[PDB]
Design a binder for these strands. Sequence first.
RNA 1: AAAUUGGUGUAACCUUACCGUAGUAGGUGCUAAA
RNA 2: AAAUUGGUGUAACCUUACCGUAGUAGGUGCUAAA
RNA 3: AAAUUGGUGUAACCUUACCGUAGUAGGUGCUAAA
Lengths: 168, 168, 168
Amino acid sequence: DNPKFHTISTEYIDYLREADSKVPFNKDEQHSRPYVGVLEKINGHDYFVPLTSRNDKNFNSQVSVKLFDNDEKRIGVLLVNNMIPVPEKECKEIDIAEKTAADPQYGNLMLKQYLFLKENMDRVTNKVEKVYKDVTVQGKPSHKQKFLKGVCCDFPKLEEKCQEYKER
Amino acid sequence: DNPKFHTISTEYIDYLREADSKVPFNKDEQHSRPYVGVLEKINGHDYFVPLTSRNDKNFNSQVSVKLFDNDEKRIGVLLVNNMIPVPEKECKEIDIAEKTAADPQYGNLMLKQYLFLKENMDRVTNKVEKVYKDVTVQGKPSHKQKFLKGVCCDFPKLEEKCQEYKER
Amino acid sequence: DNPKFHTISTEYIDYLREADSKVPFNKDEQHSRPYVGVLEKINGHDYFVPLTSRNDKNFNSQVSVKLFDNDEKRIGVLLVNNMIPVPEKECKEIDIAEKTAADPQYGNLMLKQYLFLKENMDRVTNKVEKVYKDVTVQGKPSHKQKFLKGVCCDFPKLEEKCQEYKER
RNA sequence: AAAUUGGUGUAACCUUACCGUAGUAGGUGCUAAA
RNA sequence: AAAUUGGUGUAACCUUACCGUAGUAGGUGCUAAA
RNA sequence: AAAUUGGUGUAACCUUACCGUAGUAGGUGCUAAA
């Protein structure tokens, strides 16, 4: 019921972006892009929603969740349009206490993000279900479904790729 | 479920005040007195509750609803004691956007009044039912019913007048 | 459902402290220590929870309720650890209006305490039940039950004393 | 990283929220009358 | 337009709310003790 | 009057709240990034 952050291996990310160019760059050079775990599986897949720090972009509310700290500063945006299915061997859980020891500023940011998300996980969940449903409909897309398909990863294609990974 | 404002024809108002002198003067010279529509019919009649701008009078809470704007200024009082039954041909719906085009200050006041009322319509409804019941009881009036009868229009008499109008 | 304050006769208090030294000193010299009545009887006994003005002590939350006024000043602490069973002849109801006439400052303090408590009586009740249960368990006490037994009056012993009083 | 349609309020603007069983919250403006 | 009783809080005052299965919210005052 | 353990938050500090089906509220600090 309470969100867990994760980093995803750049190997698996690059492997996914082969099938869909909208998968987020991992930029693992200093802080590998954290993802939030969707609370329940979707069609047997563990899904993960990427965070971005590009807080001032034009986001449509249907595919994003803006995070705010107690003083109302923008502290990240969850991109539900770029959520991805990931196998449990290609993701690592983030220990905020650990991250705070290695990098005090960043770990504390992550704590703020955690405190915001545990109050707002209903909304993430809600949006995740609405867009997944609409992106995966067939066949003739409404006006909205066309927009969603354009701005979102090809979820079904990525699920196949996840399946293909399960040759291990 | 959301309130609609109306103006009432001065012909019908004058016709009602023949039967009961407590019917409100319409003062149609610049802004004909707006009324709020009671959400549900009463004994088959559409009832309408008059607004007044006399915000500082001594009102008893049982027969009034004070409206306030976001900065807490007084912006009207609904006189449930002066509510009246009106046939649908003798009342016109108020288009706030239209009124705002013709008279920016007044139309905007009316918007504020609308925004307040849509949050407070339960209370209007509640008070409308309590006073209508008490005014129309028989036979021997309690202390309260005597007060209410004195300060309120003779609802049953006005309903008869409404019926008589239905010769059309 | 709404709390009543009481004073308890110093005779009965001294009689109780014979059996358990943790019973609160009554200090009846100017303002006899007020107690709040537990809303429901416990095993047939009327219980009363003492107030203290020692607002800055180290209290454990499990056995106390801190009272605050509207400006957030500390205005007493209910000691659920020192609650006692009292027969109805050894306690007097406090008339706050009366106390306010005799001693304006103190009576008004008591009003503030009343206004706080009527909003917080669920918590008093809640804590009263938890500690009474744990203090009166047997036989082998948990870590917590040992702490509670040490800091609380011997409720069962005081109940016997209450029974013994009923020779009247 | 990039890409974020169109809609929902008797709602003028910004931020926030909502998504078709769709308008929440904070500002700004207006400061009006029967 | 005019006319708005009396009541509800262990509640002193103002505004607000409530209406007999009746006291909410914001101020002011008090700033007390076991 | 005295006496107030130990615990509960992906929670650094103070106050407040909670009590094992256990972390609410207000401050302080941090002001970080993909």
